[PDB]
Every structure is written in structure tokens, then in C-alpha cells.
Design a protein around this ligand. Structure first.
Ligand SMILES: Nc1ncnc2c1ncn2[C@@H]1O[C@H](COP(=O)(O)OP(=O)(O)OP(=O)(O)O)[C@@H](O)[C@H]1O
Ligand SMILES: Nc1ncnc2c1ncn2[C@@H]1O[C@H](COP(=O)(O)OP(=O)(O)OP(=O)(O)O)[C@@H](O)[C@H]1O
Ligand SMILES: [Mg+2]
Lengths: 215, 60, 73
């Protein structure tokens, strides 16, 4: 050393480190409460759903009277049910899904439409892609195919000039292996419009009458 | 650390560093106080998650 | 891969021997059992035999006798 008063700074260096080490414990704890904060909210949201109850969906089958509506439920049997002042008469039309309670059966709100669990599986097929010329020599068949398909879809407006009925529907036929499904995938990709891709037998059900409902 | 060492005998007088340590007395008693304040709070919060989570466990 | 030839040639026995030997998952499936008169859910037996298989991939779906769902007509 330099001094025997450097024996007194040996002890004072420690105090300094302690003070710069308790500040980082003060940042530790402010990070520890905000980590527990989210865990309270993650369970607070579950409380709020839990002390609530479910809704049971209907749709407006027919208007009867001001405060009385006839619905046909998605589970089946028709009811007459009431309305809160949480919905308007000018905000209801038929085939519009409505909520009901499962403890009083009264509409509180307007509900968007429903759509099959089955048809969402078809929009998740898009693989098997190929380019716009992806069938060799059958490129002529692509031209025939788009005249019904791609051109009026994009612009109906040039077919007003022609004056004919709106083009609809095509049959592909030929022995197996000729890329009928491949041509299907190729006109799905290139147009890029919403696309399904329905299995023949994933639109059949055991019950004869649900098989009709899907399509 | 950066202060109260053999570097700062050269630069600054030695009663300066004598009095430094007694200001770090005053400053670290405040710093320890606030550390326990934010410690006591987390023990209550943990219990209020439990009170919520018990309900969730019956459903579970 | 198709196996074919007269009855008794050894086809079934191979299939078992190799799938267990290399440790590729061997699903045991018989063709008429997919034909059920619950059809739509019996057609969903077919769907689920692929559903299992895509999680249990790679996997070998050995269908014994393919003239019920391999019909000409
Ligand atoms: N006409 C074709 N030109 C080029 N490649 C083809 C053609 N047809 C089939 N392929 C190739 O064969 C693959 C599988 O054939 P795909 O499943 O399209 O058969 P398909 O005979 O059209 O079906 P289906 O028997 O159900 O009508 C394609 O992904 C593609 O690689
Ligand atoms: N190369 C071989 N070496 C030893 N044993 C054999 C051989 N080939 C066939 N076998 C014997 O003959 C038996 C009959 O063949 P297996 O039943 O396996 O096939 P298969 O043609 O699918 O008949 P099936 O459809 O009538 O059941 C085998 O189980 C085995 O005992
Ligand atoms: Mg056999």
C-alpha cells in the first residue's frame, strides 16, 4: 500500500459494492411483481368466464310480435323467446344467429353466422401445387378451362357485352392419371380465390339429412 | 469499486473518502428499506393467485 | 407398394417380418372392417386411420385383402 489509511478504504470499498448491489436487488423485485401480475390476470380472466354461463344459439325463424320472436334452435326444437333492450328490431333480420340464455332464454345480442367444422378442413388443403403451365400438351385444355372460370370471375363486365347467361360449371372426365385433380389444384393456386376441395365422402354422415345440410 | 481505493488517495484527500463512507450509510439505509417494501408485496400477491386458482382446480 | 401373386406365397408374413425388424410402426388393418353401415362415420374410420398415421408417422398401413376397397367397379 500507500498508507495505513488504505486499511480504512479496504472496509469502505465493501460498503460501496453493497450499495450498488442493493440497487440491483431493487430492480430484481420490480421485475418479480410484474411477472406475478400477469399470473393473477391469467386467472382473473378465468374467474370471469367461470361465473358467467354459456349461451345457446338460435336463429330468427320468424318474427311474431314486438317482444316475442320465434326461433329455430341449432339443437332443434322451436321456441318463443324474448328480447332484452340490448338488441333492436331494426338490427334483427331472419337467418341471423341470435344468442339465448340457458336460464331464461332471452336474446341479449346479435351473433355472426356459423359455418361447418367440416368445411374448414377443405380450406386447409392447398398442397399439390403446380405452375400455370403444369400439364404438358394439355395446355390447350387450360385455355378452355379459364373461359368459363377465370375470366367472368375476375370481370363479369365484359360478358354483358356478349349478352349471354352467366357461365357456370365444368366437368372433367378421362381415365385415371390425366391430372383432373392436378388441373383442379392449378386453377386454385393461379386464381388465388377461396378454395375447397371437397372429399366425396367427408360430406356424408351416418344420419341421412345431415349429409344434405353440409352442402 | 470505482471510489474509496488507492487511485483516489492520489487524486483526492483522505478525509473526503472518510466522509464518503458515512454518506453511503445514509443512502444504503434508504435502499434496504425499499427492498423490503417490494418484498412484502409479493407474498400477498401469491396468495391472491391461490384464492383464484382453487376455484379453477375444482373445475379441473 | 403393392404385393400380389397367388394365395399362399408368403406376402402377409413378409410384411410383418420387415416392419417389426426395422422398427417402422405397423398398423394392422383389415379391409372389410372399414365397410360399415354407419357410413360417414365408417368412412371416418378411413379418415382416422390416416389421422392416427400422420401423428405416428412414419408408419406402414398394411391392409390385408384389397378387393373390397380395391374393387374394379
Ligand atoms: N397430367 C399430368 N401432367 C403432369 N403431372 C401429372 C399429371 N397427372 C398427374 N401428375 C403427377 O401425378 C401426381 C398425382 O396425380 P393426381 O393425384 O393429380 O392424379 P389424378 O389421376 O388426377 O387423380 P384422380 O384419379 O383422383 O382423378 C401429381 O402431383 C403430379 O406430380
Ligand atoms: N419363402 C418362404 N419361406 C418359408 N416359408 C414360407 C415362404 N413363403 C411362404 N411361406 C409359408 O407359407 C405361409 C403362407 O403364406 P401367407 O399366408 O403368408 O401369404 P398370402 O399369400 O397373403 O396368403 P393369404 O392371403 O391366403 O393369407 C407363410 O405364412 C409361411 O408359413
Ligand atoms: Mg393375407
Amino acid at each position: 500500500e500507500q498508507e495505513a489509511h488504505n486499511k480504512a478504504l479496504n472496509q469502505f470499498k465493501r460498503k460501496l459494492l453493497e450499495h450498488r448491489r442493493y440497487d440491483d436487488q431493487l430492480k430484481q423485485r420490480r421485475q418479480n411483481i410484474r411477472d406475478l401480475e400477469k399470473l393473477y390476470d391469467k386467472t382473473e380472466n378465468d374467474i370471469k368466464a367461470l361465473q358467467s354461463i354459456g349461451q345457446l344459439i338460435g336463429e330468427v325463424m320468424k318474427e311474431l310480435s314486438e317482444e316475442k320472436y320465434i326461433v329455430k334452435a341449432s339443437s332443434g326444437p322451436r321456441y318463443i323467446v324474448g328480447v332484452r333492450n340490448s338488441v333492436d328490431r331494426s338490427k334483427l333480420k331472419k337467418g341471423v344467429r341470435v344468442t339465448l340464455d340457458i336460464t331464461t332464454l332471452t336474446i341479449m345480442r346479435i351473433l355472426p353466422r356459423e359455418t361447418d367444422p367440416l368445411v374448414y378442413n377443405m380450406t386447409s388443403f392447398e398442397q399439390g401445387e403446380i405452375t400455370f403451365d403444369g400439364i404438358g400438351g394439355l395446355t390447350e385444355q387450360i385455355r378452355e378451362l379459364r373461359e368459363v372460370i377465370e375470366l367472368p370471375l375476375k370481370n363479369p363486365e365484359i360478358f354483358q357485352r356478349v349478352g349471354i347467361k352467366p357461365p357456370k360449371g365444368v366437368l372433367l372426365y378421362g381415365p385415371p392419371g390425366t391430372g383432373k385433380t392436378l388441373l383442379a389444384k392449378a386453377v386454385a393456386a393461379t386464381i388465388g380465390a377461396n378454395f375447397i376441395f371437397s372429399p366425396a365422402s367427408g360430406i356424408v354422415d351416418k344420419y341421412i339429412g345431415e349429409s344434405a345440410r353440409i352442402i | 469499486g470505482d471510489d474509496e481505493l488507492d487511485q483516489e488517495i492520489l487524486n483526492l484527500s483522505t478525509q473526503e473518502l472518510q466522509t464518503r463512507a458515512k454518506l453511503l450509510d445514509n443512502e444504503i439505509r434508504i435502499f434496504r428499506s425499499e427492498l423490503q417494501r417490494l418484498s412484502h408485496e409479493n407474498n400477498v400477491m401469491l396468495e391472491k393467485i391461490k384464492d383464484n386458482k382453487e376455484k379453477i382446480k375444482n373445475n379441473r | 407398394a403393392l404385393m400380389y401373386g397367388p394365395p399362399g406365397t408368403g406376402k402377409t408374413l413378409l410384411a410383418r417380418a420387415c416392419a417389426a425388424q426395422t422398427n417402422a410402426t405397423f398398423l394392422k388393418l383389415a379391409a372389410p372392417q372399414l365397410v360399415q353401415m354407419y357410413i360417414g362415420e365408417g368412412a371416418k374410420l378411413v379418415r382416422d386411420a390416416f389421422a392416427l398415421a400422420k401423428e405416428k408417422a412414419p408408419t406402414i398401413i398394411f391392409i390385408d385383402e384389397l378387393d373390397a376397397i380395391g374393387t374394379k367397379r
